[PDB]
Design a protein around this motif. Structure first.
Motif, PDB file in Angstrom:
ATOM      1  N   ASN A   3       5.857  -0.381 -12.340  1.00 15.27           N
ATOM      2  CA  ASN A   3       5.451  -1.779 -12.086  1.00 15.27           C
ATOM      3  C   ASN A   3       4.877  -2.398 -13.296  1.00 15.27           C
ATOM      4  OD1 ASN A   3       6.231  -2.156  -8.773  1.00 15.27           O
ATOM      5  ND2 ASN A   3       4.583  -1.173  -8.635  1.00 15.27           N
ATOM      6  N   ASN A 115       0.074  -2.118  -7.684  1.00 14.34           N
ATOM      7  CA  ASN A 115      -0.480  -0.589  -7.848  1.00 14.34           C
ATOM      8  C   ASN A 115      -1.055   0.089  -6.471  1.00 14.34           C
ATOM      9  OD1 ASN A 115       1.877   0.045  -9.340  1.00 14.34           O
ATOM     10  ND2 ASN A 115      -0.267   0.457 -11.314  1.00 14.34           N
ATOM     11  N   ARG A 116      -2.414  -1.440  -6.252  1.00 13.83           N
ATOM     12  CA  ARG A 116      -2.305  -1.185  -5.239  1.00 13.83           C
ATOM     13  C   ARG A 116      -2.964  -1.922  -3.732  1.00 13.83           C
ATOM     14  NH1 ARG A 116      -3.428   1.382  -9.781  1.00 13.83           N
ATOM     15  NH2 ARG A 116      -2.337   2.016  -8.905  1.00 13.83           N
ATOM     16  N   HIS A 117      -2.111  -3.003  -3.805  1.00 18.07           N
ATOM     17  CA  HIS A 117      -2.190  -3.537  -2.132  1.00 18.07           C
ATOM     18  C   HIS A 117      -0.976  -4.120  -2.313  1.00 18.07           C
ATOM     19  CE1 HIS A 117      -5.965  -4.551  -2.519  1.00 18.07           C
ATOM     20  NE2 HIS A 117      -6.329  -4.230  -3.980  1.00 18.07           N
ATOM     21  N   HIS A 119       2.007  -2.375  -3.482  1.00  8.86           N
ATOM     22  CA  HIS A 119       3.051  -0.920  -3.658  1.00  8.86           C
ATOM     23  C   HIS A 119       3.514  -0.179  -2.134  1.00  8.86           C
ATOM     24  CE1 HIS A 119       4.501   3.198  -4.760  1.00  8.86           C
ATOM     25  NE2 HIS A 119       3.854   3.867  -3.209  1.00  8.86           N
ATOM     26  N   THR A 120       2.278  -0.678  -0.878  1.00  5.75           N
ATOM     27  CA  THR A 120       3.039   0.004   0.814  1.00  5.75           C
ATOM     28  C   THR A 120       3.669  -0.701   1.216  1.00  5.75           C
ATOM     29  OG1 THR A 120       0.409   1.437   0.563  1.00  5.75           O
ATOM     30  CG2 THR A 120       2.075   0.600   2.512  1.00  5.75           C
ATOM     31  N   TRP A 121       3.177  -1.876   1.291  1.00  6.76           N
ATOM     32  CA  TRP A 121       4.181  -2.948   1.830  1.00  6.76           C
ATOM     33  C   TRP A 121       6.245  -2.824   1.061  1.00  6.76           C
ATOM     34  CZ3 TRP A 121       8.100  -6.892   0.937  1.00  6.76           C
ATOM     35  CH2 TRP A 121       8.598  -7.149   1.526  1.00  6.76           C
ATOM     36  N   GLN A 123       7.316  -0.418  -0.512  1.00  6.95           N
ATOM     37  CA  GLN A 123       8.254   1.137  -0.546  1.00  6.95           C
ATOM     38  C   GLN A 123       8.985   1.383   1.045  1.00  6.95           C
ATOM     39  OE1 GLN A 123       8.220   3.308  -3.687  1.00  6.95           O
ATOM     40  NE2 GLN A 123       8.976   4.754  -1.583  1.00  6.95           N
ATOM     41  N   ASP A 124       8.132   0.747   2.050  1.00  8.34           N
ATOM     42  CA  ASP A 124       8.411   0.984   3.797  1.00  8.34           C
ATOM     43  C   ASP A 124       9.158  -0.513   3.721  1.00  8.34           C
ATOM     44  OD1 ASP A 124       6.922   2.691   5.464  1.00  8.34           O
ATOM     45  OD2 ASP A 124       5.122   1.814   4.440  1.00  8.34           O
ATOM     46  N   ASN A 125       9.410  -0.992   3.262  1.00  7.01           N
ATOM     47  CA  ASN A 125      10.765  -1.981   3.202  1.00  7.01           C
ATOM     48  C   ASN A 125      11.677  -1.606   2.140  1.00  7.01           C
ATOM     49  OD1 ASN A 125       9.448  -4.542   5.047  1.00  7.01           O
ATOM     50  ND2 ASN A 125       7.955  -3.756   3.865  1.00  7.01           N
ATOM     51  N   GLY A 127      12.391  -0.734  -0.955  1.00 10.50           N
ATOM     52  CA  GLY A 127      11.754  -0.859  -2.271  1.00 10.50           C
ATOM     53  C   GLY A 127      12.029  -2.016  -3.341  1.00 10.50           C
TER      54      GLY A 127
END
Ligand SMILES: CC(C)c1ccccc1[C@@H]1CCCN1C1CC2(CCN(c3ccc(C(=O)NS(=O)(=O)c4ccc(NC[C@H]5CC[C@](C)(O)CC5)c([N+](=O)[O-])c4)c(Oc4cnc5[nH]ccc5c4)c3)CC2)C1
Length: 137
Positions: A3, A115-117, A119-121, A123-125, A127
């Motif tokens: 990122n 990287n902190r807020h 990255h989760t969404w 990767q869960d969509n 990428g």
């Protein structure tokens, strides 16, 4: 995908397209999506750049308040593109207001927030690859 280099290459492009000198389909997709978004909201971006009033010790607060208000009701690809376009506006305004060194700090804020807020969404969509499949060339 790193990122950090996504932020560095996007910011370098947005500044080079204004006259300042500061694995690849993602960068080209973010470039095309951001350019179209900044063209569609030209009036809103002109008002935003006019009312920014960038000072060295208020840039981080203005950046944060807009970012969290943008992702307050969830994340999508369009709001991520707007996040990138907003960072480019802040870098251009920093160069515009005799504050070129601020670009580096802005790049560290974007990277961190990604990287902190986000990255989760992401990767869960699917990428960034799903970002290129949906709106990339
Ligand atoms: C200046 C202002 C505007 C501003 C900027 C930055 C931060 C804050 C602000 C301001 C300050 C206070 C208020 N606040 C504004 C309120 C606000 C308005 C905007 N709003 C939102 C939120 C979501 C979408 C939304 O549709 N998302 S989407 O369905 O995921 C999505 C849909 C399409 C694409 N691409 C299609 C592609 C483009 C490239 C092409 C042409 O080659 C091929 C086709 C993408 N994509 O990622 O590329 C994601 C949106 O509409 C679009 C419409 N088309 C867009 N094309 C690129 C981005 C994009 C976004 C506006 C978010 C909330 C932001």
């Amino acid at each position: 995908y790193d990122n950090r280099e996504i932020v560095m290459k996007y910011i370098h492009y947005k500044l080079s397209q204004r006259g300042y000198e500061w694995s690849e389909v993602v960068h080209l997709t973010l470039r095309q999506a951001g350019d179209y978004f900044s063209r569609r909201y030209r009036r809103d971006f002109a008002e935003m750049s006019s009312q920014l009033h960038l000072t060295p010790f208020t840039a981080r607060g203005r950046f944060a308040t807009v970012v969290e208000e943008l992702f307050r009701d969830g994340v999508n690809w369009g709001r991520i593109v707007a996040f990138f376009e907003f960072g480019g506006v802040m870098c251009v305004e920093s160069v515009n207001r005799e504050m070129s060194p601020l670009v580096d700090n802005i790049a560290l804020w974007m990277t961190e927030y990604l990287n902190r807020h986000l990255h989760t969404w992401i990767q869960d969509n699917g990428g960034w690859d799903a970002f290129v499949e949906l709106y990339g060339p």
